[PDB]
């Protein structure tokens, strides 16, 4: 219906706002664009599903997220990809892992404080009826 389309549009608006906030955070700069193959040529061979905050914005705009759970799965992937690609004890790896975990924690904390559980439940019920 028009009402259900209104619900998903509201979800997109909310998700764009959360993502923009995460994108303007200086700690998360390395996650704002896809990993450049000039800079990291073996990335695409090790990491099977690259994800970054610009791609998340693209996916919002393409109507790919119908629930906040589907969005958080992509935030989770940004984090897991960083942990997988940068697993060593050296400080460069530790720094990017800390930032990855902070990105994930920040997104979850924003959602916990600002997303009404009944709104998420409505989105899930519309999605499941599709």
Ligand X SMILES: Cc1noc(C)c1-c1cc(NS(=O)(=O)c2ccccc2)cc(C(=O)O)c1
Q: List residues near ligand X by CB under 6 A.
A: 29-33, 35-36, 39-40, 82, 85-86, 96
Q: Which residue is nearest to ligand X (CB)?
A: 36
CB-CB neighbours of 47 under 10 Å: 17
* Between 29 and 73, CB nearer to ligand X: 29
Task: Say what angle helices 2-23 and 91-114 make with each other, to 10 degrees.
Answer: 140
CB of 31 to ligand X, least distance (A): 6
Q: Which is nearer to ligand X, 33 or 98 (CB)?
A: 33
> Are the C-beta atoms of residues 5 and 60 closer than 8 Å to each other?
no
Query: How many whole angstroms from its chain centre is CA 17?
Result: 12
CB 34 → ligand X: shortest distance, Å? Answer: 7
Cα-based distances in Å from 28 to 61, 97, 130: 21, 11, 35
Least separation, in Å, of the C-beta of 84 and ligand X?
A: 9
CB of 38 to ligand X, least distance (A): 7
Residues in the chain: 130
Indicate the residue among 102 and 122 with the shorter CB distance to ligand X. Answer: 102
C-alpha 44/C-alpha 34 separation (Å) is 10
Q: Which is nearer to ligand X, 83 or 115 (CB)?
A: 83
């Amino acid at each position: 219906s028009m009402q259900e389309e209104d619900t998903f549009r509201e979800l997109r608006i909310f998700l764009r706002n959360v993502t923009h906030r995460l994108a303007i955070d200086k700690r998360f700069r390395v996650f704002t664009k896809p990993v450049d193959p000039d800079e990291v040529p073996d990335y695409v061979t090790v990491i099977k599903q690259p994800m970054d905050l610009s791609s998340v914005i693209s996916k919002i705009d393409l109507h790919k997220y119908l629930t906040v759970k589907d969005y958080l799965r992509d935030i989770d992937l940004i984090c897991s990809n960083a942990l997988e690609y940068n697993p060593d004890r050296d400080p460069g790896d530790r720094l990017i892992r800390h930032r990855a975990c902070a990105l994930r924690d920040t997104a979850y904390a924003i959602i916990k404080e600002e997303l009404d559980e009944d709104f998420e439940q409505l989105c899930e019920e519309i999605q499941e009826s599709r």
